[PDB]
Amino acid sequence: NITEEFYQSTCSAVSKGYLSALRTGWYTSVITIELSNIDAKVKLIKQELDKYKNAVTELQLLMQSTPATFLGFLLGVGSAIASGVAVCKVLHLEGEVNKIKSALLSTNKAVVSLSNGVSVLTFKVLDLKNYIDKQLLPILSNIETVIEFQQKNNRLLEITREFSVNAGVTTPVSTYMLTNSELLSLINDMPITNDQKKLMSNNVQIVRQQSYSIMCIIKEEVLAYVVQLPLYGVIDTPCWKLHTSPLCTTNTKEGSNICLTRTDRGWYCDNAGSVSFFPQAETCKVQSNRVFCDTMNSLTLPSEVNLCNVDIFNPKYDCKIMTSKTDVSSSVITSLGAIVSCYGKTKCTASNKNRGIIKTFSNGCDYVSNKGVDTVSVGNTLYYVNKQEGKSLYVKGEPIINFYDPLVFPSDEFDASISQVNEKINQSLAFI
Amino acid sequence: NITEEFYQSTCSAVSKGYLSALRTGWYTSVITIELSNIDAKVKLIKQELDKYKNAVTELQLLMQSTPATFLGFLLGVGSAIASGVAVCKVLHLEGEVNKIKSALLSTNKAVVSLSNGVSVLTFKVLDLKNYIDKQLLPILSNIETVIEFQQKNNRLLEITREFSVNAGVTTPVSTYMLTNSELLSLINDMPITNDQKKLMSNNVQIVRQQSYSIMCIIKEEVLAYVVQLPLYGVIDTPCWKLHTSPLCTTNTKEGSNICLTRTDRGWYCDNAGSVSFFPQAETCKVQSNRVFCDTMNSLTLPSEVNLCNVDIFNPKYDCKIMTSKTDVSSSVITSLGAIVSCYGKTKCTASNKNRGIIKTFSNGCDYVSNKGVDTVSVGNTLYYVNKQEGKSLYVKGEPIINFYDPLVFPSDEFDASISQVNEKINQSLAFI
Amino acid sequence: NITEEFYQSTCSAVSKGYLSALRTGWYTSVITIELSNIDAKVKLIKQELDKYKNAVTELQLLMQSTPATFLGFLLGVGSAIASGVAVCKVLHLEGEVNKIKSALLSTNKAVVSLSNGVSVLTFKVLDLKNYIDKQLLPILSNIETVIEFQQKNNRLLEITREFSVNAGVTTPVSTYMLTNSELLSLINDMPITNDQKKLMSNNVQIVRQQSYSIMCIIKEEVLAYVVQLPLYGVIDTPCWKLHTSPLCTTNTKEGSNICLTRTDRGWYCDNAGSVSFFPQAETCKVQSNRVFCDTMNSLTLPSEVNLCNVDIFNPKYDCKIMTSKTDVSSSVITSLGAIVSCYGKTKCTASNKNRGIIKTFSNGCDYVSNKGVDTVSVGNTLYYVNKQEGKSLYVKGEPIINFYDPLVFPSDEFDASISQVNEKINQSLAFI
Numbered sequence A, B, C: 001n002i003t004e005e006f007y008q009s010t011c012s013a014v015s016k017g018y019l020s021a022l023r024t025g026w027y028t029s030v031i032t033i034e035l036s037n038i039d040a041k042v043k044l045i046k047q048e049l050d051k052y053k054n055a056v057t058e059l060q061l062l063m064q065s066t067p068a069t070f071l072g073f074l075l076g077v078g079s080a081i082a083s084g085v086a087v088c089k090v091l092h093l094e095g096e097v098n099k100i101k102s103a104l105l106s107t108n109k110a111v112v113s114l115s116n117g118v119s120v121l122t123f124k125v126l127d128l129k130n131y132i133d134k135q136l137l138p139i140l141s142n143i144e145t146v147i148e149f150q151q152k153n154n155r156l157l158e159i160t161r162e163f164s165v166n167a168g169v170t171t172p173v174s175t176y177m178l179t180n181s182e183l184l185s186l187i188n189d190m191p192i193t194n195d196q197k198k199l200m201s202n203n204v205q206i207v208r209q210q211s212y213s214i215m216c217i218i219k220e221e222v223l224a225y226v227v228q229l230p231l232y233g234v235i236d237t238p239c240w241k242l243h244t245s246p247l248c249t250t251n252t253k254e255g256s257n258i259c260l261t262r263t264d265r266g267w268y269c270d271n272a273g274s275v276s277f278f279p280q281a282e283t284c285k286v287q288s289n290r291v292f293c294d295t296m297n298s299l300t301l302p303s304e305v306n307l308c309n310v311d312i313f314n315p316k317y318d319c320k321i322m323t324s325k326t327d328v329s330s331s332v333i334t335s336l337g338a339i340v341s342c343y344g345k346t347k348c349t350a351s352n353k354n355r356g357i358i359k360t361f362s363n364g365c366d367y368v369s370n371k372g373v374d375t376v377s378v379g380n381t382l383y384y385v386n387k388q389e390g391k392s393l394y395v396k397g398e399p400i401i402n403f404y405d406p407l408v409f410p411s412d413e414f415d416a417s418i419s420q421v422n423e424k425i426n427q428s429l430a431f432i
Ligand SMILES: COc1ccc(-n2c(=O)n(Cc3cc4cc(Cl)ccc4n3CCCC#N)c3cnccc32)cc1OC
Pocket: A070, A073, A412, A413, A414, B070, B071, B072, B073, B322, B323, B324, B411, B412, B413, B414, B415, C073, C414, C415
């Protein structure tokens, strides 16, 4: 059940009904490929064997160094593959690769305890040693062997291609790195809750986009790369999306108008007694009513930040805004409708596909729901609205920009707030 | 005929002679692939059949949810695939896929009227049902069949790969989604003007970059994805590119200087009596003298915005600037030359490849055309200039930063304008 | 030897010990592919020949036009492929392609002098003319020829695929454009120093990411694309990375606090008597202790900018800061530790994997090294620290935010500095 409320007073709208899936941690698995030491049909086999050798050499040469890779400016700075790189660094210690090679001798999956105590799931996805030693060495022939060897070697060649243009670190994790069944069985044998396994298994395409593949080591006929998978430690909490657009006065004299915009737009999810706030567009991914975000791109805020939607002048949280005199027209397409900021001479309308223009917006900030509306036009820009089913509520209220004296209004404030704007107005009213 | 003018007074330059091709709308087509229900040569065929089945399963599991995906901060916010997703949602209604399956029984292209009245062009690009049922079922053999089945199945495997790492939505649209001849014949059978067909057909690589492929439904042996193609409703209007760079005073005492920069840089195209303004770099693509832009990334401005180039103090449009005291050196490579903002101790030169340094810039903002100039250097940064043919005109004029008293100059104004700067100066001159 | 210093007084940290590799120029090579003019086994060959012809046609149609493609806002604007496009433009002049075709008749590599004097290295990587004329024309059969022709043609098909979704300009340069051995031998036959050859050869994956492939011309059975490779004219100079985080007062009354942040974070490298400053995250790539940057994304600053780390009030360089009252909590993961900006009610801790929480941060800006620390948590965000070996030094000092009177503190200054903040404070203290 997705619902939406538009606040006429602040030119903003909140879409709720979403459920969280936040990446809070990382799981590191070690994916291995076992390697071999080494007429027209034999010629094709030798050409494919050369492609095999060059791929090994290319990956060997690849890792002569350590692997590396409105309110967004308030975010901190993480190191996204620090956990995977740390595991990879452990794999270079003496005897470490040999432990993995021994654990996977009689099975393709095994949990191995690394020397520093880290327990990682290991996975041998391709045994090229067995194939080359048992099927190709006796030759050095028929066409079926040529075809089969090309099929088996192709995956190594494609993994190498990906690492070669990504400096050894890829994201999203492709099906060459981990096929769909491999990833599913990895998730299944992963030490996580039943809710997490079901969530990851039903959203593998999102899991791939939030994962990293880190080329790690070639040693003792073992090719190992670390696949860093997301841990969703927050699931099924309420989330809501805040959409904001400029609210300006609408006086006829050009340049005499003042504007404010709520700057706190983005995704919000309840999380551990606080609210995780994701300011940056497209750092969250919506699947139906589930929203996948990454806490690395969030601020942790008091839950009172939500009061800004119902009462922007509330005394418990100082709601953030920016101010200007740039009254240009635009639209913000919401989850269930469209906010329209129409100023000046701009033509602003809403239309249905079958009937055409059904509403002409007057100057100011207004809203239409997606029920019976297919597009909105603001100036020369046509916007298609989202056709998701859900109820919108229009909350009438006097635009708060009307409460300000333009003669003392502080414009060109970007990182401002209700209180900071009051503070500056008081200082200007004092000097006069 | 590309031409350029440099305005010494405002440290800016305008390149004109370009012709518009603006994406104003979207066309949605439905691309279908028909699917089949299901010794060494048979073993290779069974391995390829398993890859076929796993791809179907992977795509089935992929769509258990709804598909989703200086002055730029003034732009609105659209929902780029809202139109395609709406069409995809219609394809899930009962009987809808069956209509497409029936329309394409005896032909690979057909226009189908969907239940909600939407008329979409449909296209069956691959009949794997016919191939597997008529060529592979009788077996369950020779090597040529193995090769042929791998060739036909590969496209399904690659489409699936693309969707798997893009969560079901890809852009640009690859030749696996729509081959070049397929796209060309799609454009040809598209209900659009002759000018649009010629424009799209001669610029298919740009059409691909402005299109989306949306994985939609697998149902009744039909795989359908929606290809959302750009509609160019504005073509062949004049466009011009505005380049700007900081203009600072050049006093010797460090820190005593003041700067302004025109913030209205970007692409401008005449459009329907107004001007479409594209502030963000690389949201427009230039092909010779044709500039492809997307109106979703534009403001719609009065045509008087153009007056800022010839007279930044004009009374009809309030030209936008930012102010600072950060007099750092840089260059802006224009269409036909280079703007050089040289301040402090920076070494700023222009060179020809055969002769070396031909000009040393003094402190201030200056310009050289690309005629006889191959590179400019500002500090430790070497810039190659564009070698496009065209005439430059140097418009001499006193740098407007000289008209300001630094003691009342308001610096650190980002979203400012000529008038707002005058307004603040008047208030500062009043208190004194 | 990577080392790090944390400055408690300014909530910042400098990581040093790195060595530079800066792209300062471009080298343009011309890569060519020689082309041919043109039962179940012959049917597969004819299908592959059609894919060959369509690829040629697609590339012909592709180039009917000219090829094109905190403090970051201070950077200039370059034209990254201006040098390659200029070389490509020369290849269209009459007789130019014929010179390359003649130079490569008896050898696959040759230096050619173009008509405008430009000396380019040329490279024929694939002779499809010889293969089709000598192996396929006599037929118009066996399965080995079908397999071999698919192998040879595949590279042309993949190059075309890359150009088709990139509008003729790709970066990174893939192994289809230039295989690893091809690139290595290109570097080896390149007219550059021994240090550059060793540097490029040991970091080919970075070379690929800093290179462009520009589809140029199909003419006289020759397919030519220009590969624009980086020239590293600055190597082995000291580089250091500056990390910064907000420094706020910690009074209990919400909203009464003031903040400043050093805005000069990014990479710094000594360069030709000045310092190249790279403000933008991830425009530099670190390989062990070598940092690859691009001077196009740099400012050239006086070396005195370094004084801001030891003495932010130094009289020789005016250190840049931003000011606000937005005291939100976050962390910055450094090279060898973590800066923690903890304000309000936020829970801020540091943990070891084996023992859990070992330190709880109090309000203010603080730091922990990565020795014995695996993660830090600030609010709902868990950060893994980098586990690189190296020594950290904690430089104690009074937070400089304590020196400011909040009643006259100018907040919401983004492009500010120590002196500009003093200037504004003096004007506010004068009116009172
Ligand atoms: C990507 O889209 C965006 C574009 C701009 C903003 N944005 C800011 O960051 N600031 C703060 C600020 C004030 C200031 C003063 C001067 Cl003298 C110079 C640089 C200044 N900066 C940073 C500018 C960075 C760039 N370019 C803004 C202040 N007013 C309006 C918009 C602002 C936000 C965006 O995210 C939606």
